[model samples]
Every structure is written in structure tokens, then in C-alpha cells.
Target: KPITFVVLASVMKELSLKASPLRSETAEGIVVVTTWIEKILTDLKVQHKRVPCGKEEVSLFLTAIENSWIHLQYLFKCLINVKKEVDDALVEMHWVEGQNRDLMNQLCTYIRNQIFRLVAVN
Candidate 1:
């Protein structure tokens, strides 16, 4: 069966909740964020390839994309909005230097493109 909007929304909500933190103290946490974004991209790609033709299905798909995009934007903010001294120091010294910013930015751009593609599908 094709994926449903409710499934997509549930996935997005779960990822958003998992990604709500501003700083990840452990390498594992960062890995989890990356994995979540990758999973979202994979899901979107699969849906795009199998997009339904019915008006109601199209509406649901578009809504799912828009809702997921909003959650992704929030996740991106969480990745970049570090303010604590310890967090800032850790980011600067470890992950930021290792290209987390570039990775997050690229993911955000990709999500934005997916949103546009969904809009254009109508």
C-alpha cells in the first residue's frame, strides 16, 4: 500500500520531537539527527516516485510535504540555535569544525526543494 499523510505526519512529529534540542552533548545524538533527516529524504523520494493521481490523494501528499517541511525547518533551527557557552564551545571545537553546519544547510535546502517539487506537482 502507498504511504498515507498520517504516517508521514507521525514520522515528522516524532523526528521533530527528537530534534527539538539545541545541543547534542554526545556524538550519538548528532548521528541520530543526521539519520532522521536522511530517513525523511528517503521517504519523500519514495512518495514522489509513487505519487497518487487522485485529487484527494494529491492534497494529502502536498499537505504532508508542507507539514514535514515546517518540522524540518524547526529541526534545522534546533541544530543551529546553540547559545550556551558550553554548547557553543563544543560546537565550535568539535562538530561545527567538522561540517555540521554545511550538512544541516544542505539538508534544509534539499527539504525546501522537495517542498517546491510537491507544490509544482499540482
Candidate 2:
């Protein structure tokens, strides 16, 4: 279980790093979601510092990723508004959005698997 948490944390850290590139974009939506993800990572670290391990840790991580998925979708919609600015940019951003969505789905699935493992163990 501890290892599972560590792996989950690593996934989030990777996603945060990937999102850094979008921070420079002029799109407010991209900037907003990037900032939100960074804040969530920070908050997650703080929460882990206090609890270290528990169902709450899992729940917190799950909620953060879910929120990120929602925000990413919103960011994609924002990109649509500015698609005329750069044809290639919009297409690239759309691809990045899809990758991030997939990453979020993978993380959520891992969390669910871990939960089920814990349940089976008990």
C-alpha cells in the first residue's frame, strides 16, 4: 500500500512537470489550469505530510486528479476559442489535452485497483 501511494505521487509529479510547458502560453485557460494543478500538488504534499498514509490520502489524490480532468476539459474548450490564431498550435494543444486526459484516467484506474486490493486483503 505504501508503495502504491509512492507510485501515485510520482505520477502526479510527472504530470505537473509536463504541464509546466503550457505555463508560458498566452491562453488564460491553459495558464489557469496549470496554476491549479501546481497548487493541487502543493496541497497534496502538505496533506501527505500530516497523514502520511490512509484512505484519506487516496481520496485526496483521487479528487485532485478528477478536478484536473475537469479543468483540462475546460482548458480545451478555451483553446477552441483561439483556434484561429495558429492552426498547428491548436492541433498540438488538442493532442496534448488528450494525452493528459489519458494520464488522468490511468491514475484513477490505479487508485481504484489499489482500493480493491486493500479491500481484498482485509
Candidate 3:
């Protein structure tokens, strides 16, 4: 199957939805985002169809080819739109860090209120 741009567009949009994960404290970083998108890409498929082309329809064939090119260009633009979705993963990682960071921008390290660690050990 040639996977005409119509099917390609739907597949790409499906990929977009699957790539977008809901914000949850349990989910962390770009790892899950990348995994979901990569899984969809690996499982992507097309249905094969065979049709008889009559010898008398050169204009029809030419028109079909032209429309294919047009749609293909549109699909390329759609791809760029999805490519910009990298920010989605960044938000996931950043939001996690946002909750974890203090004034020092560190997690569980050098706290402002240590309250005297190992009291009287010295």
C-alpha cells in the first residue's frame, strides 16, 4: 500500500494524541513521552488494496498523482507541527523539578532549614 496522504494525516494525528501524556505526579520526564511515540511509530501500518486501472483513463491517473503531491505537502507541514511538540515533554520534566526545587534549585540537598544535622555528634 502506498499510504496516501489522507491515511498518513490520520496516522500522524493519532501519533500526536498518543504522544501527549496527561500530567501526573507519578509520571516523570521525557522517557515516557518518547516511549509512547516510538511505540506508535513501530506499530504503524497500512491496509493494502488492489484495484483495476482501465487503460482509457490517463487524465484520471494524472489528476490522482497531482492531488497526491498536494496532500503530501500538507502532510509535511503537519509533521512540522508535531515536531514542535517537544515542549510537551519539557513541561513534564520541568513541572516535576518545579515541585522538587527549593531556593537553591536542588532536590533533597543543602536545604534552607536543615535544623542541625547529627546534633552533638562533634
* Top-scoring candidate (TM-score): 1
lDDT, candidate 3, 34-95, per-residue tens: 34333332333211122233232110010000012335411110010011133332111111
Q: List the residue pairs that clash in candidate 2.
A: none
TM-score winner between candidates 1 and 2: 1
Candidate 2 stretches with Cα past 4 Å from truth are 1-99
- What would the TM-scores of all predictions be? 0.24, 0.23, 0.20
How many pairs collide in each candidate, listed in order? 0, 0, 0
Ranking under lDDT, best-scoring first? 1, 2, 3
Model 2 TM-score, all chains together: 0.23
In terms of lDDT, the best-performing candidate is 1
The lDDT of model 2 is: 0.30
Q: How much does candidate 3 score in TM-score?
A: 0.20
Model 2 / residue 22 / CA error / Å = 49
**Number of clashing residue pairs, candidate 3:** 0
How does candidate 3 score on lDDT?
A: 0.23
Worst 10 residues of 1 by lDDT: 86-95
lDDT of 1 by residue, 1-122 (tens): 11111113323333445555464433333233334434555675523122233322211121122113335421222222111222211111111222234444444456535533433432
> Tens digit of lDDT per residue, candidate 2, span 1-109?
0121112333333333444645543433323332433344454442211112332111122222223533542321101111111211111111223224555444435
Clash list (residue pairs), candidate 1: none
